[PDB]
């Protein structure tokens, strides 16, 4: 599963 940090990376890329 994606790490929390990897989900944050996705959020800040798209927002």
């Amino acid at each position, epitope marked *: 599963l994606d*790490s*929390f*940090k990897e989900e*944050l990376d996705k959020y800040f890329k798209n*927002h």
Partner: antibody
Amino acid sequence: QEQLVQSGAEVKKPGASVKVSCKSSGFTFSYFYLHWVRQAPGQGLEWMGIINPRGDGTRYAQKFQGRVTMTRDASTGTLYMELRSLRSEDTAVYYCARGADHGAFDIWGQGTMVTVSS
Amino acid sequence: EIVLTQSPGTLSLSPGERATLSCRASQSVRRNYFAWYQQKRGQAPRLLIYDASTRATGIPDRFSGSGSGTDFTLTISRLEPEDFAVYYCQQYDSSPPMYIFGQGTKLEIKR
């Protein structure tokens, strides 16, 4: 040896602003998301916001948006919180914290006491 | 907004006894993004448990956590003097970033 060390105690008048600093040692500063958390006298912990590793992305707790600015300086390895339009209810200890890859706060600074009074 | 309710507010126990601390989330905690912290008087908090049940490095193995969904528990199997402190639970999410703390449980020495 993984550490966060914060600047010293602050005393401010209402309406002023304060900029607290937090300098890392013992790890790669630019790899990590960083946070500020505060704790009013006798109260619990309150997350203030997060800044991304590059420093170009932040997200703040709804309570502090419009009043807080979080920045980081890769050249000095230092994280900053500026809180504006201070009121006495901003009297608190302010902590910086490192976000681990799993998201929880695994390294904490020692805290900076901020007193806001007339 | 999610709200984390800790129980009890104060827990009075003697050294050597087992401590059970509870946290209830007002809605389901995505991916068990859940942590426990200890805070001794005049000190910064320290991470004890993350992912609801994983002990952080260097934390004594008398600390353990469990739970999922809305109900989470921190257990101290046998209390030592250094364990009497305030304990906070924490919930978090990544998209969008949000971090919420329980209101704290004071673990007090019962004489």
